Structures are given as C-alpha cells and as structure tokens.
Amino acid sequence: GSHSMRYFYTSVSRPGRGEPRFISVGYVDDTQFVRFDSDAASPREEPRAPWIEQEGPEYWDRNTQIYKAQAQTDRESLRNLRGYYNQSEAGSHTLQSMYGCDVGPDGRLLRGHDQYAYDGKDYIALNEDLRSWTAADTAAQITQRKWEAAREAEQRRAYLEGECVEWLRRYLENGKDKLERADPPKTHVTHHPISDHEATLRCWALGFYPAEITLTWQRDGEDQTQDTELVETRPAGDRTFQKWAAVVVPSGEEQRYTCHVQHEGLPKPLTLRWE
C-alpha cells in the first residue's frame, strides 16, 4: 500500500546548563529505525530496527557526519531566531524539523514534506509544489528570503524526489517482513466491578502493528461508542502498540456485550465476549 519515511529533529538550547542538544529519529511508517542523540557519549547514528543493522560502516559514518553538521546548522539557526524575536540569551528555545516522503503501492512519490516549528509554533514549511515556502510571521519571512536566495527548495526537492524515495524503497524491501506485514493484537476482555450492580468490561488489544486500530463495544448488536472509554494508542515498547476500550455494564448482562476489533493484521474482524 502507501508508505512514509520521516526524520524528526529536535534542537534545544540550555543556556547555563550546556551547549544545545540535538536528537534525530528516523521512521518508516510507525517503525523507528535509527536515532542520533548529541548527549550520548561519542554520539553516532544507532540502529533501532533489526533490518537496518546490515547497512555497512559507510552508511553509519556518513549519517553520523550529517547529524553533527545538522546539529551545528541548528545551533546557528537558534542564535539567528532569538535575534529575529529579540529574545534573551538566558532562555531555553526549541527548533523542530520534520521531513520525508509518502510513496504509493507502485513506490512512486505521492508528496514531500519539509517543515519547522520554533517554541512549539509553525515557523516555515515547504509547499506541496516543493518549490515555494509559506512563512508564519515576519521572522520566518527573513528565513524565506534567505532560503529563496540560496535556492534551498531545490536542495529539499532533490532529496524528496531522489534519496528519500530510493532509501524508503530499499528499507521496504529489507524490512518487508516487519513493514509490509501487519501483526494482529493479542485480545481479551477483563471484568472490573465498580459499584454494587455494575462492572467495567475492558477490551484489550496488545502488541499490534501498525498503530491504526478500531475497538468497538456493542450491546445486542447496538453501537456503544458514545458510552465507551478509549485510551490513546500507546507503545508496548517493542515496536508494537496497545489500546483498550471500556464500557460500564449491568452485572450478569456481560454476554450482551461484544467487542469488535478491526486491524490490518486480522483477516476477519474479531468479535470478543467476556469469558
């Protein structure tokens, strides 16, 4: 189907604690496959998925150099930005970057992204044409004039149409067993008395991939979504995810309630009852 590759960068100034920290993470779909953290001892790009480990020393060495150069460029961006906003040298500030590509089932480019936030707010973004910028305020219009003069958009486009798509396709072949395949959840229903006559029924989906999932309670086939408590999907910590959905039911009427589980890993949606 469709696929995505993203790099997320965070640069944080820490005046009077140390030099700014730089953290990069790479993701294919919902899977983290690399990381770089400037606070690690002698920092290097490190593998976070088994299928990337086979990349040779040139891969790791060059990417490490890229992150160190990007971290330095971000330190200069942070100094420039507190210039533009006339901000104190004593404050901690945050520059975030996100970029990458979406490809269709054919492996052709659908869309490219290259966007930034300063102190939690949209700053500048590459438009869908991958040729022009949208600035959020007059500070970002400075960056925009600079980046137009330097033809930054064409540097971004070359990555998004070239290496982004070509490396994503390589990762989708090498990690196809974990990226092209879904892992269904382990499922069960638990029973939790809350008062004298009522029980919470909690429908559990554990260790599923990808994150996208629908858990629905029915009572005698009737949708109970309006009375259902859903927790935010959460990482299991092994690359898989967790979710549950809870309804309050009358004690003894539990067999009226079906939990319906929809996930790409399930050939047919599941129907579960408290047992």
């Binding site: 790479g26 891969y59 990417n63 150069a69 990007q70 460029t73 971000d74 600079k146 971004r156």
Partner: peptide, 9 residues
Amino acid sequence: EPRSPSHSM
C-alpha cells in the same frame, strides 16, 4: 538515510 544539511535559518 537523512537529508544533507544546507542553510541555517
């Protein structure tokens, strides 16, 4: 693989 750095803001 990550994109090469270019200009500062």
